[PDB]
Amino acid sequence: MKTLSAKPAEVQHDWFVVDATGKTLGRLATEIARRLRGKHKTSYTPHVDTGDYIIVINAEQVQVTGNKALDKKYYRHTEFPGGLKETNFEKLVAHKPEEIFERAVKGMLPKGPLGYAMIKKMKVYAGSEHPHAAQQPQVLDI
């Protein structure tokens, strides 16, 4: 038993705030997923959540390359017959950037109860202000 696993009670979650102006969506999402899962700590345990809280501001300024802004399609099916609905990146970023980040990160996060719990630690806001001043987040450049 000389190798030990992290104890959930002893885990400490630190708060950070990230600005999305001008960055590339996927290359930002990879780092966000890493920090949410806790791969950056020497106490990392696969079955325990050791990540950190990540706030995102200016989410509607996220950028994509090529023609993806027009040609990247988001789908969703209502279980009724013929119920397939479609949208694209520009409209979706104009209307609900939170959904953009949620999709990008949930795709890269594990699928299960632990994944659902881990994704709760991400807060995304379209504006430059966030309501979490009480938690005292620190600026993180990623």
Binding site: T3, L4, H40, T42, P46
Partner: protein, 117 residues
């Protein structure tokens, strides 16, 4: 010389059921279903005794990588530097040190980058 089977057969079935205890529904109550459950459990144990080494090595590598990137190196570069420096400490001990003592792991990283350069 007529022979009755009851005692021996009952003993065998009882032993199988005793090994089966803790399973759900018919698996822990019915001999036919229970006997299949025990064999599959044995097969899974045979496969997992091998899988365990791989899983623990992967965990050690991940923890070492986290420590190395805190000290400013990647896992591969740190391993190469240690090999050049001729350090023969294994990954299990390196991961334990990384988790429990930051100063010593920092000294090891210093030695590794020194060997690299």
């Amino acid at each position: 010389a007529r022979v009755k089977r009851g005692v021996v057969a009952h003993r065998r079935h009882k032993k199988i059921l005793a090994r089966a205890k803790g399973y759900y529904g018919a698996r822990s109550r019915v001999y036919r279903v229970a006997f299949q459950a025990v064999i599959k459990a044995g097969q899974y144990a045979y496969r997992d005794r091998r899988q365990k080494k791989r899983q623990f090595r992967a965990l050690w590598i991940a923890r070492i990588n986290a420590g190395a990137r805190q000290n400013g190196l990647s896992y591969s570069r740190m391993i190469d530097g240690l090999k050049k420096a001729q350090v023969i400490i294994d990954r299990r001990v390196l991961a334990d040190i990384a988790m429990h003592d930051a100063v010593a792991f920092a000294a090891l990283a210093e030695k590794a980058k020194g060997a690299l350069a």
